[PDB]
Amino acid sequence: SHSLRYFVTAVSRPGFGEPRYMEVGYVDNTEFVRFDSDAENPRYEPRARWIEQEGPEYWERETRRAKGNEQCFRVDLRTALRYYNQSAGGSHTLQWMAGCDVESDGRLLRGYWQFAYDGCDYIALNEDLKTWTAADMAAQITRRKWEQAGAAERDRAYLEGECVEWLRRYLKNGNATLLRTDPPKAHVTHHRRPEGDVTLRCWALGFYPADITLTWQLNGEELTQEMELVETRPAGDGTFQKWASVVVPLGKEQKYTCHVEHEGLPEPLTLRW
Amino acid sequence: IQKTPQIQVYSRHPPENGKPNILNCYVTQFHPPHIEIQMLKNGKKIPKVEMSDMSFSKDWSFYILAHTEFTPTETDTYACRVKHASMAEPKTVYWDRDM
Amino acid sequence: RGPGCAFVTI
């Protein structure tokens, strides 16, 4: 399965002009388009090689869409001030994510159309693509409004139609790169500590897509040892990195195994020091 | 409604002194989105640092990548300095080759 | 292609 997702942010800056409005689009973990209202001559712009050959009509249509959305989000930010009885002097953020998860046979697995205000859930289209989940009393105003307007119908039509159709085209355009499942290359490093014990660190490098699970285990028992798991991070070349550590007694290193699961692996990896 | 940035400083490839590489500063889990990020060599601002487009995660927090070309040596020190409203003063994180 | 607000506001 694959995903097409757009991430939209407006941030007000009272006293410094109109809000900054931005969009970024992704296929799976690969960015491919951007918009930034603060750029000189703002236009929708390519950020992956396999989108650069969409014709001029594509960029004109997406730029027009972004500039209409920008006006919408200006209105939304002003309305949020009224809903929350907030002063006109503060900076606030409105975020929006929309997109589709699609199986390789074209089946829509899940559609998303959801918002956050000042970094917290505001309103979200439910998995049925028919009803809304509102996070507070302000969002209940929006829910009533969009229910009476039938807003979800148009949203669902995008998620079941346009989103699915264009994801298919993008995967065709970028089939030389987007379909890969590069498995992690893994190893364990060993670091004696001054305290007399040992840090074992299990590394996973060079993998795509970004989803991965790294786990330290013994022989089924729950590990009470001190552990640490860093956030998955981009290498910058289209692959990702992660590590996971455990502090173990000196002389007991061989009791611990690191287990690695990833879409690109035919079998999960098990590694020891 | 303020999230403090998490900062990782790391090379693209396993580092070898004398071998060209890329140094990354990956900054995540922050809100609001306004942030200032600088990469430093021996305490001095590195002139050519590229910034990815900012985006946000499932939990709505923002993330961004800074990176620069470099050849690691025995004598040079690298760091990433991040200024965000959630922090009183900018935070400097040094490159740890084992992390 | 991306989603359009279609001037449906909160």
mmCIF file of C-alpha atoms in Angstrom:
data_model
loop_
_atom_site.group_PDB
_atom_site.id
_atom_site.type_symbol
_atom_site.label_atom_id
_atom_site.label_comp_id
_atom_site.label_asym_id
_atom_site.label_seq_id
_atom_site.Cartn_x
_atom_site.Cartn_y
_atom_site.Cartn_z
ATOM 1 C CA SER A 1 0.000 0.000 0.000
ATOM 2 C CA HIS A 2 0.961 3.656 -0.496
ATOM 3 C CA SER A 3 -0.181 7.064 0.714
ATOM 4 C CA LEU A 4 -0.654 10.511 -0.812
ATOM 5 C CA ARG A 5 -0.827 13.225 1.850
ATOM 6 C CA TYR A 6 -0.864 17.018 1.976
ATOM 7 C CA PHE A 7 0.214 18.959 5.061
ATOM 8 C CA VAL A 8 -1.118 22.529 5.281
ATOM 9 C CA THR A 9 -0.195 25.186 7.867
ATOM 10 C CA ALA A 10 -1.275 28.802 8.346
ATOM 11 C CA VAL A 11 0.337 30.877 11.097
ATOM 12 C CA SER A 12 -0.876 34.351 11.934
ATOM 13 C CA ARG A 13 1.538 37.169 12.786
ATOM 14 C CA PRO A 14 -0.555 40.182 13.828
ATOM 15 C CA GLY A 15 1.251 43.425 13.108
ATOM 16 C CA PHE A 16 3.424 41.813 10.412
ATOM 17 C CA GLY A 17 0.893 41.400 7.622
ATOM 18 C CA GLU A 18 -1.212 38.414 6.680
ATOM 19 C CA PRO A 19 -0.619 34.849 7.901
ATOM 20 C CA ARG A 20 2.114 32.721 6.402
ATOM 21 C CA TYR A 21 0.482 29.911 4.418
ATOM 22 C CA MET A 22 2.325 26.707 3.452
ATOM 23 C CA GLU A 23 1.564 23.352 1.821
ATOM 24 C CA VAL A 24 3.780 20.278 1.455
ATOM 25 C CA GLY A 25 2.833 17.061 -0.364
ATOM 26 C CA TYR A 26 4.195 13.533 0.149
ATOM 27 C CA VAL A 27 3.942 10.128 -1.463
ATOM 28 C CA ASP A 28 4.781 7.669 1.354
ATOM 29 C CA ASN A 29 7.877 9.218 3.035
ATOM 30 C CA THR A 30 8.971 11.145 -0.102
ATOM 31 C CA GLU A 31 8.248 14.871 -0.367
ATOM 32 C CA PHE A 32 7.340 15.993 -3.875
ATOM 33 C CA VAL A 33 5.585 19.433 -3.911
ATOM 34 C CA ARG A 34 5.578 22.605 -1.818
ATOM 35 C CA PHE A 35 3.902 26.019 -1.570
ATOM 36 C CA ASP A 36 5.024 28.978 0.562
ATOM 37 C CA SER A 37 3.149 32.282 0.582
ATOM 38 C CA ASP A 38 6.311 34.101 1.745
ATOM 39 C CA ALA A 39 8.303 33.168 -1.357
ATOM 40 C CA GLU A 40 9.009 35.696 -4.076
ATOM 41 C CA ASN A 41 6.220 35.052 -6.600
ATOM 42 C CA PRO A 42 4.560 32.163 -4.719
ATOM 43 C CA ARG A 43 3.826 29.121 -6.886
ATOM 44 C CA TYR A 44 3.340 25.428 -6.329
ATOM 45 C CA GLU A 45 6.818 23.981 -6.894
ATOM 46 C CA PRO A 46 8.324 20.534 -7.573
ATOM 47 C CA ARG A 47 10.466 18.866 -4.911
ATOM 48 C CA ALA A 48 11.015 15.457 -6.550
ATOM 49 C CA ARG A 49 12.406 14.664 -9.982
ATOM 50 C CA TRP A 50 9.420 12.522 -11.001
ATOM 51 C CA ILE A 51 6.947 15.438 -10.721
ATOM 52 C CA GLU A 52 8.980 17.979 -12.730
ATOM 53 C CA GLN A 53 7.444 16.907 -16.053
ATOM 54 C CA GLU A 54 3.834 17.616 -15.198
ATOM 55 C CA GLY A 55 2.906 20.266 -17.710
ATOM 56 C CA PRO A 56 2.250 23.941 -17.045
ATOM 57 C CA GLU A 57 -1.470 23.275 -16.488
ATOM 58 C CA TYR A 58 -0.657 21.249 -13.424
ATOM 59 C CA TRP A 59 1.358 24.000 -11.752
ATOM 60 C CA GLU A 60 -1.195 26.670 -12.679
ATOM 61 C CA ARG A 61 -4.047 24.586 -11.236
ATOM 62 C CA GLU A 62 -2.208 23.714 -8.032
ATOM 63 C CA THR A 63 -1.060 27.315 -7.525
ATOM 64 C CA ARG A 64 -4.656 28.518 -7.964
ATOM 65 C CA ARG A 65 -5.841 25.896 -5.460
ATOM 66 C CA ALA A 66 -3.218 26.909 -2.899
ATOM 67 C CA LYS A 67 -4.058 30.602 -3.231
ATOM 68 C CA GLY A 68 -7.757 29.919 -2.709
ATOM 69 C CA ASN A 69 -6.932 27.761 0.308
ATOM 70 C CA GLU A 70 -4.768 30.586 1.668
ATOM 71 C CA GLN A 71 -7.781 32.919 1.690
ATOM 72 C CA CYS A 72 -9.898 30.235 3.384
ATOM 73 C CA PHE A 73 -7.322 29.802 6.142
ATOM 74 C CA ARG A 74 -7.205 33.560 6.753
ATOM 75 C CA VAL A 75 -10.959 33.421 7.350
ATOM 76 C CA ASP A 76 -10.579 30.316 9.519
ATOM 77 C CA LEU A 77 -7.953 31.952 11.742
ATOM 78 C CA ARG A 78 -10.201 34.985 12.266
ATOM 79 C CA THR A 79 -13.174 32.744 13.065
ATOM 80 C CA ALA A 80 -11.123 30.772 15.596
ATOM 81 C CA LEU A 81 -10.415 34.030 17.448
ATOM 82 C CA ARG A 82 -14.175 34.517 17.807
ATOM 83 C CA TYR A 83 -14.904 30.907 18.793
ATOM 84 C CA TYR A 84 -12.229 30.982 21.514
ATOM 85 C CA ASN A 85 -12.694 34.665 22.508
ATOM 86 C CA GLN A 86 -8.991 35.312 21.910
ATOM 87 C CA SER A 87 -7.276 38.664 21.458
ATOM 88 C CA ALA A 88 -6.405 39.840 17.956
ATOM 89 C CA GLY A 89 -2.783 40.408 19.017
ATOM 90 C CA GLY A 90 -1.504 36.845 19.390
ATOM 91 C CA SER A 91 -0.012 34.432 16.852
ATOM 92 C CA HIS A 92 -1.992 31.245 16.240
ATOM 93 C CA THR A 93 -1.674 28.204 13.987
ATOM 94 C CA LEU A 94 -4.192 26.229 11.948
ATOM 95 C CA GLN A 95 -3.080 22.886 10.503
ATOM 96 C CA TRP A 96 -4.789 20.567 8.032
ATOM 97 C CA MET A 97 -3.839 17.093 6.815
ATOM 98 C CA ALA A 98 -5.714 15.362 4.004
ATOM 99 C CA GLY A 99 -4.895 12.300 1.969
ATOM 100 C CA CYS A 100 -5.470 8.666 1.139
ATOM 101 C CA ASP A 101 -3.975 5.264 1.967
ATOM 102 C CA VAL A 102 -4.415 2.987 -1.060
ATOM 103 C CA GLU A 103 -3.648 -0.692 -1.553
ATOM 104 C CA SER A 104 -1.783 -1.745 -4.698
ATOM 105 C CA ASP A 105 -5.102 -2.942 -6.191
ATOM 106 C CA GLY A 106 -6.605 0.557 -5.954
ATOM 107 C CA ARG A 107 -8.688 -0.102 -2.834
ATOM 108 C CA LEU A 108 -8.972 2.936 -0.581
ATOM 109 C CA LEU A 109 -7.814 1.758 2.833
ATOM 110 C CA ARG A 110 -8.368 5.055 4.672
ATOM 111 C CA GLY A 111 -9.095 8.703 3.908
ATOM 112 C CA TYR A 112 -8.078 11.631 6.113
ATOM 113 C CA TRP A 113 -9.364 15.209 6.344
ATOM 114 C CA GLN A 114 -8.510 16.668 9.740
ATOM 115 C CA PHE A 115 -7.541 19.916 11.462
ATOM 116 C CA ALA A 116 -5.673 21.190 14.507
ATOM 117 C CA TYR A 117 -5.739 24.647 16.101
ATOM 118 C CA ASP A 118 -2.658 25.800 18.031
ATOM 119 C CA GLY A 119 -1.254 22.275 17.849
ATOM 120 C CA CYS A 120 -4.271 20.389 19.251
ATOM 121 C CA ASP A 121 -6.983 18.319 17.548
ATOM 122 C CA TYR A 122 -9.850 20.487 16.316
ATOM 123 C CA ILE A 123 -12.071 18.425 13.978
ATOM 124 C CA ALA A 124 -11.464 15.230 12.020
ATOM 125 C CA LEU A 125 -13.337 13.321 9.340
ATOM 126 C CA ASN A 126 -14.115 9.849 10.660
ATOM 127 C CA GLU A 127 -13.058 6.676 8.859
ATOM 128 C CA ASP A 128 -16.580 6.362 7.418
ATOM 129 C CA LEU A 129 -15.883 9.612 5.494
ATOM 130 C CA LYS A 130 -19.408 10.651 6.548
ATOM 131 C CA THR A 131 -19.261 11.924 10.151
ATOM 132 C CA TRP A 132 -17.000 14.262 12.125
ATOM 133 C CA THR A 133 -15.197 14.046 15.466
ATOM 134 C CA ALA A 134 -15.030 17.458 17.156
ATOM 135 C CA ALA A 135 -12.463 17.864 19.923
ATOM 136 C CA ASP A 136 -13.995 20.736 21.945
ATOM 137 C CA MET A 137 -16.994 23.062 22.152
ATOM 138 C CA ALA A 138 -15.621 25.404 19.480
ATOM 139 C CA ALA A 139 -15.228 22.500 17.049
ATOM 140 C CA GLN A 140 -18.818 21.430 17.772
ATOM 141 C CA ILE A 141 -19.883 24.722 16.167
ATOM 142 C CA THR A 142 -17.912 23.733 13.074
ATOM 143 C CA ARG A 143 -19.355 20.213 13.163
ATOM 144 C CA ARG A 144 -22.910 21.473 13.220
ATOM 145 C CA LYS A 145 -22.109 23.843 10.366
ATOM 146 C CA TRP A 146 -20.459 21.213 8.168
ATOM 147 C CA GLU A 147 -23.168 18.641 8.907
ATOM 148 C CA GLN A 148 -25.907 21.018 7.750
ATOM 149 C CA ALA A 149 -23.866 21.978 4.679
ATOM 150 C CA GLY A 150 -23.045 18.356 3.827
ATOM 151 C CA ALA A 151 -19.352 19.265 3.698
ATOM 152 C CA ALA A 152 -18.134 15.671 4.097
ATOM 153 C CA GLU A 153 -19.672 14.619 0.764
ATOM 154 C CA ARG A 154 -17.315 16.781 -1.293
ATOM 155 C CA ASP A 155 -14.405 15.794 0.960
ATOM 156 C CA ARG A 156 -15.136 12.082 0.518
ATOM 157 C CA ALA A 157 -15.327 12.561 -3.258
ATOM 158 C CA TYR A 158 -11.779 13.939 -3.259
ATOM 159 C CA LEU A 159 -10.530 11.095 -1.072
ATOM 160 C CA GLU A 160 -12.159 8.320 -3.114
ATOM 161 C CA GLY A 161 -11.549 9.894 -6.515
ATOM 162 C CA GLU A 162 -8.924 12.556 -7.193
ATOM 163 C CA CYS A 163 -6.618 11.408 -4.380
ATOM 164 C CA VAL A 164 -6.625 7.767 -5.520
ATOM 165 C CA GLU A 165 -6.283 8.618 -9.226
ATOM 166 C CA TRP A 166 -3.345 10.986 -8.796
ATOM 167 C CA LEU A 167 -1.537 8.694 -6.350
ATOM 168 C CA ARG A 168 -1.665 6.061 -9.103
ATOM 169 C CA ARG A 169 -0.111 8.503 -11.578
ATOM 170 C CA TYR A 170 2.607 9.599 -9.133
ATOM 171 C CA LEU A 171 3.610 5.998 -8.428
ATOM 172 C CA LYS A 172 3.888 5.458 -12.189
ATOM 173 C CA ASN A 173 5.970 8.633 -12.669
ATOM 174 C CA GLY A 174 8.279 7.696 -9.810
ATOM 175 C CA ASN A 175 8.254 3.918 -10.201
ATOM 176 C CA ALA A 176 12.060 3.900 -10.411
ATOM 177 C CA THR A 177 12.305 4.990 -6.761
ATOM 178 C CA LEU A 178 8.947 5.013 -4.965
ATOM 179 C CA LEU A 179 8.327 1.243 -5.031
ATOM 180 C CA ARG A 180 11.600 0.232 -3.351
ATOM 181 C CA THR A 181 11.613 -1.364 0.105
ATOM 182 C CA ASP A 182 15.266 -1.084 1.087
ATOM 183 C CA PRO A 183 15.758 -3.258 4.165
ATOM 184 C CA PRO A 184 17.782 -2.063 7.150
ATOM 185 C CA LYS A 185 21.395 -3.042 7.550
ATOM 186 C CA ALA A 186 21.774 -3.726 11.264
ATOM 187 C CA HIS A 187 24.570 -4.142 13.783
ATOM 188 C CA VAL A 188 25.134 -3.931 17.539
ATOM 189 C CA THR A 189 27.758 -1.696 19.136
ATOM 190 C CA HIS A 190 29.259 -2.250 22.584
ATOM 191 C CA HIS A 191 30.193 0.582 24.973
ATOM 192 C CA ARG A 192 31.609 -0.070 28.433
ATOM 193 C CA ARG A 193 30.472 2.551 30.939
ATOM 194 C CA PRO A 194 32.472 3.907 33.886
ATOM 195 C CA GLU A 195 29.725 2.550 36.169
ATOM 196 C CA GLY A 196 30.953 -0.968 35.335
ATOM 197 C CA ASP A 197 28.150 -2.145 33.033
ATOM 198 C CA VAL A 198 27.696 -1.978 29.246
ATOM 199 C CA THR A 199 25.505 -0.105 26.781
ATOM 200 C CA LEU A 200 24.419 -2.230 23.831
ATOM 201 C CA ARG A 201 23.160 -0.163 20.904
ATOM 202 C CA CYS A 202 21.291 -1.799 18.032
ATOM 203 C CA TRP A 203 21.563 0.186 14.793
ATOM 204 C CA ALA A 204 19.374 0.078 11.694
ATOM 205 C CA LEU A 205 20.676 2.003 8.685
ATOM 206 C CA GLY A 206 19.733 2.647 5.089
ATOM 207 C CA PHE A 207 16.080 1.590 5.137
ATOM 208 C CA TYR A 208 12.982 2.826 3.286
ATOM 209 C CA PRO A 209 10.142 3.365 4.029
ATOM 210 C CA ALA A 210 10.577 4.907 7.464
ATOM 211 C CA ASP A 211 8.364 2.524 9.470
ATOM 212 C CA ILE A 212 10.488 0.074 11.472
ATOM 213 C CA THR A 213 10.456 -1.713 14.824
ATOM 214 C CA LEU A 214 13.614 -2.242 16.901
ATOM 215 C CA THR A 215 13.284 -4.320 20.069
ATOM 216 C CA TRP A 216 15.700 -5.765 22.610
ATOM 217 C CA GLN A 217 14.712 -9.066 24.135
ATOM 218 C CA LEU A 218 15.957 -11.833 26.372
ATOM 219 C CA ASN A 219 13.994 -15.089 26.140
ATOM 220 C CA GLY A 220 10.451 -13.745 26.466
ATOM 221 C CA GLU A 221 10.675 -12.067 29.868
ATOM 222 C CA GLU A 222 9.971 -8.363 30.216
ATOM 223 C CA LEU A 223 13.156 -6.288 30.144
ATOM 224 C CA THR A 224 13.587 -4.094 33.222
ATOM 225 C CA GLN A 225 16.967 -2.754 32.077
ATOM 226 C CA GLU A 226 17.542 0.898 31.237
ATOM 227 C CA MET A 227 16.678 1.503 27.621
ATOM 228 C CA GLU A 228 16.452 4.244 25.040
ATOM 229 C CA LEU A 229 14.975 4.470 21.518
ATOM 230 C CA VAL A 230 15.713 7.471 19.288
ATOM 231 C CA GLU A 231 13.228 8.910 16.855
ATOM 232 C CA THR A 232 13.588 7.596 13.316
ATOM 233 C CA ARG A 233 15.615 10.097 11.313
ATOM 234 C CA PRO A 234 16.368 10.785 7.636
ATOM 235 C CA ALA A 235 19.844 10.162 6.305
ATOM 236 C CA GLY A 236 19.058 12.786 3.660
ATOM 237 C CA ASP A 237 19.489 10.455 0.666
ATOM 238 C CA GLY A 238 16.039 8.863 0.784
ATOM 239 C CA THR A 239 16.880 6.348 3.514
ATOM 240 C CA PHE A 240 16.296 6.399 7.253
ATOM 241 C CA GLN A 241 18.186 5.528 10.439
ATOM 242 C CA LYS A 242 17.234 4.412 13.934
ATOM 243 C CA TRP A 243 18.829 2.941 17.013
ATOM 244 C CA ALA A 244 17.763 1.363 20.264
ATOM 245 C CA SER A 245 19.889 0.822 23.376
ATOM 246 C CA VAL A 246 19.920 -1.196 26.595
ATOM 247 C CA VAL A 247 22.248 -1.122 29.628
ATOM 248 C CA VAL A 248 23.286 -4.663 30.567
ATOM 249 C CA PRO A 249 25.650 -6.185 33.164
ATOM 250 C CA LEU A 250 29.212 -6.813 32.048
ATOM 251 C CA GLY A 251 29.475 -10.469 31.063
ATOM 252 C CA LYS A 252 25.762 -10.849 30.228
ATOM 253 C CA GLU A 253 25.832 -9.277 26.747
ATOM 254 C CA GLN A 254 25.131 -12.548 24.936
ATOM 255 C CA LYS A 255 21.765 -12.966 26.698
ATOM 256 C CA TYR A 256 20.321 -9.972 24.808
ATOM 257 C CA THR A 257 19.087 -10.008 21.219
ATOM 258 C CA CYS A 258 17.969 -7.106 19.050
ATOM 259 C CA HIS A 259 14.997 -7.806 16.859
ATOM 260 C CA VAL A 260 14.424 -5.788 13.639
ATOM 261 C CA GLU A 261 11.179 -5.750 11.649
ATOM 262 C CA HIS A 262 10.741 -3.837 8.400
ATOM 263 C CA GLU A 263 8.642 -4.097 5.242
ATOM 264 C CA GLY A 264 11.778 -4.753 3.188
ATOM 265 C CA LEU A 265 12.884 -7.776 5.198
ATOM 266 C CA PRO A 266 11.805 -11.272 4.070
ATOM 267 C CA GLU A 267 12.319 -12.383 7.687
ATOM 268 C CA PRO A 268 12.882 -10.227 10.781
ATOM 269 C CA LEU A 269 16.507 -9.853 11.830
ATOM 270 C CA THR A 270 17.862 -11.135 15.128
ATOM 271 C CA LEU A 271 21.286 -9.844 16.166
ATOM 272 C CA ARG A 272 23.627 -10.275 19.128
ATOM 273 C CA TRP A 273 26.832 -8.643 20.273
ATOM 274 C CA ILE B 1 0.563 24.433 23.929
ATOM 275 C CA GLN B 2 4.342 24.714 23.628
ATOM 276 C CA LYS B 3 6.478 21.731 22.639
ATOM 277 C CA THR B 4 10.268 21.805 23.083
ATOM 278 C CA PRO B 5 12.320 20.695 20.044
ATOM 279 C CA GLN B 6 14.137 17.365 20.038
ATOM 280 C CA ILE B 7 17.521 17.645 18.321
ATOM 281 C CA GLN B 8 19.696 14.989 16.681
ATOM 282 C CA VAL B 9 23.095 15.689 15.101
ATOM 283 C CA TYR B 10 24.488 12.874 12.972
ATOM 284 C CA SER B 11 26.245 12.068 9.722
ATOM 285 C CA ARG B 12 24.594 10.568 6.655
ATOM 286 C CA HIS B 13 27.220 7.789 6.421
ATOM 287 C CA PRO B 14 29.345 6.131 9.128
ATOM 288 C CA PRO B 15 32.040 8.730 9.725
ATOM 289 C CA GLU B 16 35.654 8.253 8.719
ATOM 290 C CA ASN B 17 38.195 11.010 9.294
ATOM 291 C CA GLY B 18 39.290 12.284 5.909
ATOM 292 C CA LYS B 19 36.317 10.884 3.981
ATOM 293 C CA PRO B 20 33.692 13.317 2.630
ATOM 294 C CA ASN B 21 30.277 13.064 4.286
ATOM 295 C CA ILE B 22 27.085 14.993 5.135
ATOM 296 C CA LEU B 23 26.254 16.313 8.610
ATOM 297 C CA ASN B 24 22.561 16.438 9.551
ATOM 298 C CA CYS B 25 20.719 18.394 12.237
ATOM 299 C CA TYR B 26 17.220 16.905 12.558
ATOM 300 C CA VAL B 27 14.814 18.914 14.726
ATOM 301 C CA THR B 28 11.430 17.458 15.697
ATOM 302 C CA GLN B 29 8.447 17.644 18.053
ATOM 303 C CA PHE B 30 8.210 21.415 18.360
ATOM 304 C CA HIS B 31 5.366 23.913 18.412
ATOM 305 C CA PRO B 32 4.877 26.705 17.397
ATOM 306 C CA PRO B 33 6.574 26.267 13.996
ATOM 307 C CA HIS B 34 8.834 29.330 14.185
ATOM 308 C CA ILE B 35 12.383 28.127 14.818
ATOM 309 C CA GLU B 36 15.953 29.232 14.160
ATOM 310 C CA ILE B 37 18.585 26.592 13.430
ATOM 311 C CA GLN B 38 22.298 27.034 12.837
ATOM 312 C CA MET B 39 25.108 24.569 12.242
ATOM 313 C CA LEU B 40 28.475 25.492 13.750
ATOM 314 C CA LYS B 41 32.066 24.432 13.067
ATOM 315 C CA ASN B 42 34.514 25.229 15.871
ATOM 316 C CA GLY B 43 32.000 27.713 17.248
ATOM 317 C CA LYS B 44 31.500 29.560 13.940
ATOM 318 C CA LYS B 45 28.392 29.641 11.762
ATOM 319 C CA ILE B 46 28.736 27.363 8.737
ATOM 320 C CA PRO B 47 27.923 29.475 5.654
ATOM 321 C CA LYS B 48 26.333 26.875 3.336
ATOM 322 C CA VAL B 49 23.647 24.979 5.263
ATOM 323 C CA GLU B 50 20.611 23.677 3.393
ATOM 324 C CA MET B 51 17.192 23.528 5.060
ATOM 325 C CA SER B 52 14.459 21.103 4.115
ATOM 326 C CA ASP B 53 10.884 22.288 3.870
ATOM 327 C CA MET B 54 9.212 22.200 7.269
ATOM 328 C CA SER B 55 6.364 19.714 7.703
ATOM 329 C CA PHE B 56 4.507 18.126 10.604
ATOM 330 C CA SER B 57 3.852 14.686 12.060
ATOM 331 C CA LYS B 58 0.805 12.637 13.054
ATOM 332 C CA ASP B 59 0.617 14.370 16.456
ATOM 333 C CA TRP B 60 0.734 17.789 14.655
ATOM 334 C CA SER B 61 4.236 18.704 15.905
ATOM 335 C CA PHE B 62 6.660 20.172 13.384
ATOM 336 C CA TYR B 63 9.952 18.847 12.039
ATOM 337 C CA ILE B 64 12.754 20.054 9.767
ATOM 338 C CA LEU B 65 16.205 18.946 8.582
ATOM 339 C CA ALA B 66 19.355 21.062 8.243
ATOM 340 C CA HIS B 67 22.396 19.608 6.501
ATOM 341 C CA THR B 68 25.859 20.543 5.259
ATOM 342 C CA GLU B 69 28.751 18.915 3.400
ATOM 343 C CA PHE B 70 31.836 18.189 5.488
ATOM 344 C CA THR B 71 34.889 15.980 5.860
ATOM 345 C CA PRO B 72 35.313 14.930 9.511
ATOM 346 C CA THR B 73 38.711 15.310 11.151
ATOM 347 C CA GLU B 74 40.378 14.663 14.484
ATOM 348 C CA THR B 75 40.498 18.397 15.229
ATOM 349 C CA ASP B 76 37.156 19.922 14.158
ATOM 350 C CA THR B 77 34.088 20.240 16.385
ATOM 351 C CA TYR B 78 30.570 20.401 14.946
ATOM 352 C CA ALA B 79 27.326 21.451 16.585
ATOM 353 C CA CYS B 80 23.754 22.503 15.911
ATOM 354 C CA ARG B 81 22.282 25.538 17.707
ATOM 355 C CA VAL B 82 18.481 25.787 17.962
ATOM 356 C CA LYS B 83 16.422 28.775 19.151
ATOM 357 C CA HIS B 84 12.732 28.192 19.880
ATOM 358 C CA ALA B 85 10.183 30.093 21.964
ATOM 359 C CA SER B 86 9.753 27.068 24.247
ATOM 360 C CA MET B 87 13.344 27.617 25.457
ATOM 361 C CA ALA B 88 14.745 30.606 27.339
ATOM 362 C CA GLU B 89 18.039 30.504 25.420
ATOM 363 C CA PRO B 90 19.314 28.751 22.283
ATOM 364 C CA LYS B 91 20.430 25.154 22.757
ATOM 365 C CA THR B 92 23.753 23.956 21.328
ATOM 366 C CA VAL B 93 24.060 20.215 20.638
ATOM 367 C CA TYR B 94 27.462 18.775 19.731
ATOM 368 C CA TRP B 95 27.960 15.967 17.234
ATOM 369 C CA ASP B 96 28.526 12.665 19.040
ATOM 370 C CA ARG B 97 29.890 10.156 16.535
ATOM 371 C CA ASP B 98 28.276 7.226 18.402
ATOM 372 C CA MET B 99 24.711 8.572 18.356
ATOM 373 C CA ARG C 1 -3.158 16.863 -6.575
ATOM 374 C CA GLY C 2 -4.018 18.497 -3.274
ATOM 375 C CA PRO C 3 -7.236 19.202 -1.406
ATOM 376 C CA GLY C 4 -9.349 22.304 -1.940
ATOM 377 C CA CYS C 5 -11.173 24.197 0.803
ATOM 378 C CA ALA C 6 -13.783 25.366 -1.743
ATOM 379 C CA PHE C 7 -14.441 28.270 0.675
ATOM 380 C CA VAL C 8 -15.880 25.917 3.282
ATOM 381 C CA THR C 9 -14.688 27.596 6.481
ATOM 382 C CA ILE C 10 -14.829 26.536 10.117
#
